[PDB]
Curated annotation (Swiss-Prot):
Modified how: Acetylated by KAT6A.
Role: Scaffold subunit of various histone acetyltransferase (HAT) complexes, such as the MOZ/MORF and HBO1 complexes, which have a histone H3 acetyltransferase activity. Plays a key role in HBO1 complex by directing KAT7/HBO1 specificity towards histone H3 'Lys-14' acetylation (H3K14ac). Some HAT complexes preferentially mediate histone H3 'Lys-23' (H3K23ac) acetylation. Positively regulates the transcription of RUNX1 and RUNX2.
Tissue-specificity statement: High levels in testis.
Location of the protein in the cell: Nucleus; Chromosome; Cytoplasm
Record's protein name: Peregrin
Residues of the full protein shown: 628 to 739 of 1214
Species of provenance: Homo sapiens (Human)
Gene transcribed to yield this protein: BRPF1
Disease in which the protein is involved: Intellectual developmental disorder with dysmorphic facies and ptosis: An autosomal dominant neurodevelopmental disorder characterized by delayed psychomotor development, intellectual disability, delayed language, and facial dysmorphisms, most notably ptosis. Additional features may include poor growth, hypotonia, and seizures.
Bromo domain mapped to chain residues: 1-105
Assembly information from the UniProt record: Component of some HBO1 complex composed of KAT7/HBO1, MEAF6, ING5, and BRPF1. Component of the MOZ/MORF complex composed at least of ING5, KAT6A, KAT6B, MEAF6 and one of BRPF1, BRD1/BRPF2 and BRPF3. Interacts (via PHD-type zinc finger domains) with unmethylated histone H3 at 'Lys-4' (H3K4me0). Interacts with trimethylated 'Lys-36' of histone H3 (H3K36me3). Interacts with ING5; interaction directs BRPF1 to H4K4me3-enriched chromatin at the 5' of active genes. Interacts with KAT7.
Length: 112
């Protein structure tokens, strides 16, 4: 079970997840300029650019560690933003659409 095809699959999966973020609100770190209190209760910020960095640094050597950081993007957003916000609903939608992306990607990983 070879590392190179696995990372290719994670790269494709990450691209598919970013595609579900049409507003690109999850693709870069939360700009602390705009949200100065963000780290007061968000202990591990996460975003798709950071996930890409982690991927290339060989920090995702199994599917579940990759999926855990995606879930962090989602859970951080639900935690920080009030329920009546666009952002909160965006995280709900990303959880749904990304969940389907991840299920299919995990299936394909098991074929390897
Ligand atoms: C939606 C997740 C995370 N991202 C953000 C990006 C930009 C802003 C902004 O006020 O400009 C706010 C957020 N908030 C978030 O929770």
């Amino acid at each position: 079970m070879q590392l190179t095809p696995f990372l290719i699959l994670l790269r494709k999966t990450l691209e598919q997840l970013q595609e579900k973020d049409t507003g690109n609100i999850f693709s870069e770190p939360v700009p602390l300029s705009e949200v100065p209190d963000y780290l007061d209760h968000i202990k591990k910020p996460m975003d798709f650019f950071t996930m890409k960095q982690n991927l290339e640094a060989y920090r995702y050597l199994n599917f579940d560690d990759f999926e855990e950081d995606f879930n962090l993007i989602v859970s951080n957003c639900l935690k920080y933003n009030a329920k009546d916000t666009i952002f909160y609903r965006a995280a709900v939608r990303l959880r749904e659409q990304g969940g389907a992306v991840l299920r299919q990607a995990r299936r394909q990983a098991e074929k390897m």
